[PDB]
Write a protein that binds this ligand. Structure first.
Ligand SMILES: CC(=O)N[C@H]1[C@@H](OP(=O)(O)OP(=O)(O)OC[C@H]2O[C@@H](n3ccc(=O)[nH]c3=O)[C@H](O)[C@@H]2O)O[C@H](CO)[C@@H](O)[C@@H]1O
Ligand SMILES: O=c1ccn([C@@H]2O[C@H](COP(=O)(O)OP(=O)(O)O)[C@@H](O)[C@H]2O)c(=O)[nH]1
Ligand code: NA
Length: 379
């Protein structure tokens, strides 16, 4: 294990997407693969670590209630050095577009430590949307020595920014690897599938289900309030449908969600769900309403219509294919688009088409090759 590879990540979406790559690298006897978590998230990170049986070698222990962007940035810069010093890695792998990604990349760049960016080249073209994720991925890509692009379009973004062609490997997105792994867990074990389903005894098998998440930082405040009012209007219009909403732990969305949506009989506010259960819910859903990046990739892959509650996106493929539509946080538009999917089975069939531009679920192997060769509702 001469080559030392340090994988670093901090949040739920990074952990899910990095898990298959961690597994692949740890399995090898000619790589010394180590994991450092920044713990930018705690519970939402731990849910992933436990599911995929990943015990980090280092944990920077950073999360505090109501932390700021500056808190996370400084926390990482202060604490990561001891990790770099202890291991002396040959390469640092970072993921995606969180403040963890940014701060780890800066720290490594400052020390001439080569960085590989898993999920490289996604762009909205707007430094204020998503905020600060667009900045985070742009900085990371500027300083990275390998760029693992999930699509040809992301590759093209990098090349247009002056990234050398030899640095960019179009590998697809490891989220497909993770999704397939979990889909298999469910399909291959009926006992497991039964247990997962039994976590949601409030679900009615005869009722259509809509699955909801929301946490984009630029949407805090008024846009989120409008999104919640749209959900209320929909819940009132479709009293026979069930609206299942796994909350996010960020207080800026958890508290208003509870305050605004807590009194509706057919809105089920639940805790953030471990990925196994969440894939079950996505698969069960009639459609999805979300501003999540990863769900914009997973939903269309599962053939589920996605109403994207953003005014822009860095995942254009599903939009172009029709399986996702941008609805922003305009209540009238959200209600209109959701209502069409309930009211028109022909609209639903026209929209519910599998779309996956992200590869065959073996992105992790391609990255490795490049480098080496019951739930109770809240009320
Ligand atoms: C700037 C940045 O990197 N934002 C990422 C972060 O946003 P997110 O909204 O989670 O922002 P933070 O990671 O800064 O967490 C904010 C606050 O949420 C609460 N909290 C969060 C996680 C947890 O496990 N327990 C907990 O209590 C804490 O009060 C914490 O201080 O994670 C999201 C995934 O979910 C990503 O889409 C975002 O890109
Ligand atoms: O309750 C939930 C909500 C989301 N996810 C998964 O979390 C990833 C997306 O993370 P998130 O939406 O928090 O952030 P983003 O992708 O927008 O950065 C995807 O793999 C989702 O399937 C999950 O496991 N449980
Ligand atoms: Na190993």
């Amino acid at each position: 294990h001469m080559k030392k590879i340090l994988l670093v990540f901090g949040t739920r979406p990074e952990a899910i997407k990095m898990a298959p790559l961690v597994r692949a690298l740890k399995a090898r006897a000619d790589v010394d693969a180590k994991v450092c978590v920044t713990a930018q998230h705690r519970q939402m990170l731990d849910q992933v670590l436990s599911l995929f049986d990943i015990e980090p070698d280092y944990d920077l222990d950073l999360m505090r209630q109501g932390q700021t962007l500056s808190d996370v940035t400084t926390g990482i810069l202060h604490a990561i050095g001891a990790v770099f010093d202890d291991l002396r890695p040959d390469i640092v792998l970072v993921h995606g577009d969180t403040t963890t990604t940014l701060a780890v990349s800066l720290a490594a760049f400052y020390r001439y430590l080569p960085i590989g960016h898993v999920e490289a080249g996604l762009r909205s073209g707007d430094i204020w949307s998503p905020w600060p994720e667009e900045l985070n991925r742009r900085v990371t890509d500027a300083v990275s020595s390998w760029h693992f692009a999930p699509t040809g379009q992301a590759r093209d973004n990098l090349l247009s920014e002056g990234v050398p062609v030899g640095s960019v490997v179009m590998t697809g997105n490891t989220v497909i690897d993770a999704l397939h792994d979990v889909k298999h867990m469910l399909e291959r074990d009926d006992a497991l599938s039964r247990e997962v389903a039994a976590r949601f005894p409030f679900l009615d098998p005869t009722a259509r289900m809509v699955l909801i998440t929301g946490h984009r930082r630029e949407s805090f405040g008024e846009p989120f309030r409008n999104f919640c009012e749209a959900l209320r209007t929909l819940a009132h219009r479709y009293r026979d449908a069930q609206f299942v909403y796994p909350l996010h732990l960020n207080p800026n969305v958890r508290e208003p969600a509870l305050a605004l949506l807590g009194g509706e009989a057919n809105i089920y506010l639940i805790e953030p769900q471990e990925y196994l259960a969440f894939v079950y819910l996505m698969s069960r859903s009639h459609f999805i309403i979300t501003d999540s990046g990863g769900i914009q990739e997973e939903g269309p892959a599962l053939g589920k219509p996605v109403l994207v509650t953003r005014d822009t996106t860095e995942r254009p493929e599903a939009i172009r294919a029709g399986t996702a539509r941008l609805v922003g946080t305009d209540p009238e538009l959200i209600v209109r688009e959701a209502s069409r999917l309930f009211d028109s089975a022909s609209a639903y069939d026209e929209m519910a088409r599998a779309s996956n531009p992200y590869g065959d679920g073996h992105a992790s192997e391609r990255i490795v090759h490049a480098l080496m060769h019951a739930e109770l509702p809240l009320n």
